[PDB]
Amino acid sequence: MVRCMKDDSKGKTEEELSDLFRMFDKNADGYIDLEELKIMLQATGETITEDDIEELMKDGDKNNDGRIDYDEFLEFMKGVE
C-alpha cells in the first residue's frame, strides 16, 4: 500500500544523459546545431576555431541532418573517446 514508492534522483550515469542534453542547448528546443553549440563553447576560456566546433557536430551527427538530439546523443555517447 505505497510503502517504498519511487526513489529520489540518485547517481545516474547513462540515464543521466537526459540532463546533459539541456546543458548543451541554448534555448532548449530539443535539438542543437553549430550555431548554438558555438555559444556553448564560449563558456570555456580557451581558443576555438570554426573548424574545431565542426568536429563536435561532425562526430556527433548521426542522422546526417547537422544537429543533435536525445537520439543522436545516446549513440554519440556509446563509445567515442
Residues that bind Ca ion (CB under 5 A): 25, 29, 32, 36, 63, 65, 67
Task: Note whether 76 and 63 are within 8 A (CB).
Answer: no
Nearest to Ca ion of 8, 32 (CB atom): 32
The single residue listed with the C-alpha cell 556509446 is 78
To the nearest 10 degrees (0 to 180), the angle between helices 50-60 and 34-41 is 120
Q: Is residue 67 marked as binding? A: yes
Residue with smaller CB distance to Ca ion, 27 or 47: 27
- Angle in degrees, CA 22, 39, 12, rounded to 5: 25
Smallest gap from residue 65 Cβ to Ca ion (A): 3
Binding-site annotation: residue ranges for Ca(2+): 25, 27, 29, 31, 36, 61, 63, 65, 67, 72
